[PDB]
Design a protein around this ligand. Sequence first.
Ligand SMILES: Nc1nccc(-c2c(-c3ccc(F)cc3)ncn2C2CCNCC2)n1
Ligand SMILES: N[C@]1(CO)[C@H]2C[C@@H]3C[C@@H](C[C@H]1C3)C2
Ligand SMILES: [Ca+2]
Ligand SMILES: [Ca+2]
Ligand SMILES: [Ca+2]
Ligand SMILES: [Ca+2]
Ligand SMILES: [Cl-]
Length: 345
Amino acid sequence: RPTFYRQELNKTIWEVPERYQNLSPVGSGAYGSVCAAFDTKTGHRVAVKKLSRPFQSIIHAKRTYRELRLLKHMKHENVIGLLDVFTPARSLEEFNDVYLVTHLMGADLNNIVKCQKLTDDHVQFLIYQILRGLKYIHSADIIHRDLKPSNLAVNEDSELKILDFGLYVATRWYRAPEIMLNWMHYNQTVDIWSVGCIMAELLTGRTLFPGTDHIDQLKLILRLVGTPGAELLKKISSESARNYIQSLAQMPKMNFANVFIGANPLAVDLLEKMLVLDSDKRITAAQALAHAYFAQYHDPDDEPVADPYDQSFESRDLLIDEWKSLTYDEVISFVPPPLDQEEME
Ligand SMILES: Nc1nccc(-c2c(-c3ccc(F)cc3)ncn2C2CCNCC2)n1
Ligand SMILES: N[C@]1(CO)[C@H]2C[C@@H]3C[C@@H](C[C@H]1C3)C2
Ligand SMILES: [Ca+2]
Ligand SMILES: [Ca+2]
Ligand SMILES: [Ca+2]
Ligand SMILES: [Ca+2]
Ligand SMILES: [Cl-]
């Protein structure tokens, strides 16, 4: 049995194995808060997320199970995955706390662009990694739906991982129009719109669509991409929303070459393929990885897809204690990955 110790962090007691030392808070995550730590078994730096009240309600209990199942499945260099999962509980009857462990990533994408004029080669690398991660999660029928710079973890060498996928006032500036406006259908390319918004901001240093509300953001979007056709209205349930959009003065699409002056023309071309209102005509992650903009990084042998992911639990309503027992089962069955899982190409 590992010896646990207790430490008050973020005004609450954490109980963690002696293996993990020097815990220091590094912010909140989805449904929990996060500490950096030193893993004395491997000498590696890790991030430990303590889930907040994981079994307080049917909502918390199912999302705890969902997050653990998702993170146990994610095995990709550009997607947050699990090094460890632990609980101080000695049995299911005591089980009330869940801690998730991953590699430490010191920053988010906002730390990278804030005080640094990025080079085009560096922008290519950052966006390439997002797209590689999205190809992987999308291949498992997992969509992020709220991709944005604060959901991209980055380390000291600009290596990037997507987090908080497949799951307080949030920024909406990177959300796909079909998501922000609650349209009746969408596909995995909601995340590609978000990539376009992020990439645009990495190239210009300015937020692409900094709208003050739903309607102001939509107006900024339409100024760039032009007024949509009537076929777009098909997707919008609310008559007042449809009537509003229809009543707008028509706007032509802008030439993105006039918006992103001085950018690599290949970057402009990629943006034109991402920032399209018609989600059926938006480029996919796998298609974008083949785009000439990423030629110096693209490597088809190193852009893998995911193993099939069984999401049948999503349609089921179970009792709190059933989700709790399922979660306990997933904690106990977890197999830590090898420290070194990669080989020279
Ligand atoms: N510093 C760092 N490094 C890696 C991940 C995180 C992390 C996690 C997280 C997820 C799963 C897990 F098992 C462990 C941690 N959730 C949110 N964040 C950060 C995301 C950027 N803002 C601060 C919190 N933070
Ligand atoms: N952000 C910008 C330029 O500042 C605004 C004006 C126009 C349309 C959108 C996207 C670009 C170009 C909003
Ligand atoms: Ca390679
Ligand atoms: Ca190796
Ligand atoms: Ca490495
Ligand atoms: Ca090869
Ligand atoms: Cl599975």
